[PDB]
Amino acid sequence: THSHGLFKKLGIPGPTPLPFLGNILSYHKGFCMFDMECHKKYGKVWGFYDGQQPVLAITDPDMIKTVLVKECYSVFTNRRPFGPVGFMKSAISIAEDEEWKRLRSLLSPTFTSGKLKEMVPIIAQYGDVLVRNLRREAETGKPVTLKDVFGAYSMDVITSTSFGVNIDSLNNPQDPFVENTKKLLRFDFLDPFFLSITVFPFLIPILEVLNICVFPREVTNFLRKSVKRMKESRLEDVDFLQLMIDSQNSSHKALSDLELVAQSIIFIFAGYETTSSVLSFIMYELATHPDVQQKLQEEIDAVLPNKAPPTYDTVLQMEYLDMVVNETLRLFPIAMRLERVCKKDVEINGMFIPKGVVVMIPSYALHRDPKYWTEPEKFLPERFSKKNKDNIDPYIYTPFGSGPRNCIGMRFALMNMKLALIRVLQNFSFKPCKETQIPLKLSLGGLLQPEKPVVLKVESRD
């Protein structure tokens, strides 16, 4: 409890921590419910303890901008230390300081709009595959589980845009390349293991010396050798792998081979469950708000008549589609929180922050803050209309973070999801079932996902 007297000294409010545990027992109702209550009880800033680790929450847009943008390179550069990681220490999302600054520079040209526009035909091909699999489920009137049909789609886009492997994962759910990649599910930080890591972070170096890794050693080994097969088959005889292979064909020393494999794994880990989960949250709102679904289908047919195939330019042309995606990401920011480690004693916006404190931004609680959003629990896409989009603070609505360490795959993720929604809504309408959980209840765990899997009815428009 020697690390529990810091917030009381600084005059910062917060829940009283227990010895060893800190405030982790308050996670019984999830990260989201704990952050909303703390914002309600304590005001604009407060503190708590993940075990012995002090966490300072901030909700001021100016102070958020200083952390994420202004003093990013100088003070708030890294996230909370994470382990055990093994060779995945070289992943950009885990790297720190100049290593991260180097990796971010080596991978930024990979995520330009020019490279993204060249990936659209590959992503659009599996929009068609998604339709033929949805139509087989629609011609047989059976509730469809969205996470399975979208999870199959997200897996398809990943395998093709990152390695050129072309699989119908829904009809080959057991191909060895699909088996390993489907094990890359995002971490439940409230599960028994990660809560124990919070109480015994001194055990992280012990797990590392035993080569134990939060990424399953069999999946990383499979992709490590699979990449080294592809690397020596293209060399010599458009995806993310080739962009990184061309990058290491050189300031910063070219991407290493092991460094390159770590980024490929991170791109799969980042885009698999996220793209599948968001697309399920979107179709839930469209099915429970049919007027929104019709207005979107009308816009899609206006830009793409006769079910015209979507393109890069016609996707950005659609504004109500962007309004629906943004509004869904408001109600369900799957990151929930943003974090930065304060690397040195600083004073920002008139507040002292000691070295070692984890500065946290509660994105979920701010996305539902009535002091910034009217009727925050309601699905209202008109908040993001070209008229009202000016009245939204970019440091309150942060579904992809902000600053130099925001989501590097933001453009890709938005284009990937919008291409799916266009092709799906051009051919189908989605209606609730009896077994559809209405209203949707969120999981009380550490992942932003529905309590029950979203099941809906799918009807063909032809």
Residues in contact with ligand HEM by CB under 6 A are 92-93, 104, 266-267, 270-271, 274-275, 278, 334-335, 338, 399-401, 405-409, 412-413
Q: Is 195 in the site for ligand NJ0 (CB under 6 A)?
A: no
Q: Which one of ligand HEM, ligand NJ0, a second copy, none interacts with residue 432, CB within 5 to 8 A by kind?
A: none
Do 408 and 111 touch, CB atoms closer than 8 A?
Answer: yes
Residue 361 binding ligand NJ0, by CB under 6 A: no
Measured between alpha carbons, how far is 402 from 68 in angstroms, rounded to an integer? 6
Amino acid code (one letter) for 97: D
Its sign, for the CA torsion 184, 189, 192, 193, is positive
For the record, the structure tokens of 4 come out as: 């529990």
Q: Which of residues 326-345 bind a second copy (CB under 8 A)?
A: 344
- Closer CB to ligand NJ0, residue 86 or residue 143? 86
Tell me how far, at minimum, the Cβ of 131 lies from ligand NJ0, in Å. Answer: 26
DSSP 367-396: HT-TTTSSSTTS--GGGGSTTGGGGS-TTT
Nearest distance in Å: CB 271, ligand HEM: 3
91 lies in the site for ligand NJ0, by CB under 6 A: yes
- Which of a second copy, ligand NJ0, ligand HEM, none does residue 217 bind (CB under 5 to 8 Å by kind)? none
Question: Number of helices and strands (H, E) in the chain?
Answer: 17, 10
Round to whole Å and give the CA distance between 442 and 452: 8
Q: Does 104 bind ligand NJ0 (CB under 6 A)?
A: no
**How many chain residues touch a second copy (CB under 8 A)?**
9
Partner interacting with residue 205 (select from ligand HEM, ligand NJ0, a second copy, none; CB below 5-8 Å by kind) = a second copy
| Nearest distance in Å: CB 432, ligand NJ0 | 27
Nearest distance, CB of residue 86 and a second copy, angstroms? 10
From 109, 121, 176, 205, residue interacting with a second copy (rule: CB under 8 A): 205
Partner interacting with residue 267 (select from a second copy, ligand HEM, ligand NJ0, none; CB below 5-8 Å by kind): ligand HEM
Residues whose CB is less than 8 angstroms from the CB of residue 219 and which lie 6 or more positions away in sequence, other chains included = 180, 181, 183, 184, 265
In this structure, what token pair is assigned to residue 141? 């009137």
Contact region with ligand NJ0 (CB under 6 A), list: 1-9, 88-96, 343-351, 369-377: 88-96
**Helix (H) / strand (E) containing 105:** helix 97-107
CA atoms of 151 and 138, how far apart (whole Å): 17
The answer to whether 32 and 448 have CB atoms below 8 angstroms apart is yes
Residue 262 three-state SS:
helix
Interface stretch with ligand NJ0, choices 7-15, 70-78, 331-339, 435-443 (CB under 6 A): 331-339
Pick 203 or 308: Cβ nearer a second copy: 203
The answer to whether the CB of 190 falls within 8 A of the CB of 34 is: no
Q: Where are the alpha helices (DSSP H) in 166-311?
A: 176-181, 192-199, 204-209, 217-234, 240-247, 257-288, 290-303
**Residues near ligand NJ0 (CB under 6 A):** 79-80, 82, 91, 93-94, 186, 189, 266, 269-270, 274, 334-335, 339, 407
**Residues near a second copy (CB under 8 A):** 98, 201-203, 205-206, 208-209, 344
